[PDB]
C-alpha cells in the first residue's frame, strides 16, 4: 500500500544521501 | 511531510546529479 | 496516481542503469 | 510486467551496489 511504498523511498532516500556524501 | 510524489523527483534529482558526478570524473 | 509512480520510477531505474554501466 | 514494489526493491538493490562500490573505489 501507500504506507509500504512511502517506507521503502524512505530507505532509498538514506541510501542516497549515504551515496553522495560518499563523493 | 513529503509525498510520494515529491520523494520520487527528490530520487530523481539525486540520481541526476550521481550520474553527472561519475561521468564528469571518469574523464 | 499509480501509473504515474510506475512512469517515475521507469525513469528512476533507467538513471541507475547508466550510473552502473558508468562504473 | 513489475509492480510498484518490485521496482522499489530493484532500486533498493541498485543503490546497495553503487553505495558498494564508491565506498569501496573511495580507499
Known amino acids: ?6 517506507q521503502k523511498l524512505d530507505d ?3 541510501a542516497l544521501a549515504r551515496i ?4
Open 1 to 6: 500500500d501507500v504506507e509500504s511504498v512511502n
Open 12 to 14: 532509498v532516500i538514506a
Open 20 to 23: 553522495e556524501a560518499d563523493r
